[model samples]
Target: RLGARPCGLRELEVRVSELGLGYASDETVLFRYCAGACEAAARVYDLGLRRLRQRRRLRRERVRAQPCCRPTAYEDEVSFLDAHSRYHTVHELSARECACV
Candidate 1:
């Protein structure tokens, strides 16, 4: 669990056929997945949220006031062979880099 930073890129070993992409492939792949949490938001943003909560506006309506580590970019096209010996490509599936958002 202490492999790296609290927010960073992680990897998963998976088979293309198991992806449920409709097509089938026997090839195994190293998938890039973004994992972890982000720090707090801007100082002013935090203060404002607290103020709103104090005024009961936060609970009055739903709010996603938390930060998150998410993918901002992705790996380009990845191609694999289907069970029928046909090639298929998938893009924007694997994450490349992540950011606090």
Candidate 2:
């Protein structure tokens, strides 16, 4: 029942069931279910954000590590120069090649 967007939270039974708590509702059971769901969501969000940050960090590192000809004052056209001294214009690179470089 999950989707690309957050779903509604109006139904306690549904929410509890989604958390694998079944259809039990005492005060303690309800409280435990709610707390469990909240904790799970918090952990998921925390881990997701952490992974996103790590990916961004890695991307920045990869960009910084790439060997390229430094841009000159007159032009915005950058050149990718490999160890063999072969120069490839930025526009010539494919999408994946650009990302890797």
* Candidate closest to the true structure, highest lDDT: 1
Best by TM-score: 1
Tens-place lDDT digits, model 1, residues 20-94: 888778888889987875664466776787688778876587665666788989999788888889988899879
Candidate 1 lDDT score relative to the true structure? 0.79
lDDT of 2 by residue, 10-87 (tens): 213222223343332222111111011111233554666557666685444423222222211222332444345554
Which TM-score value belongs to model 1? 0.77
State candidate 2's TM-score: 0.16
Name the regions of candidate 1 deviating beyond 4 angstroms. 1-5, 53-62
Q: Estimate each model's TM-score.
A: 0.77, 0.16
| Each prediction's RMSD to truth | 3.2, 27.1
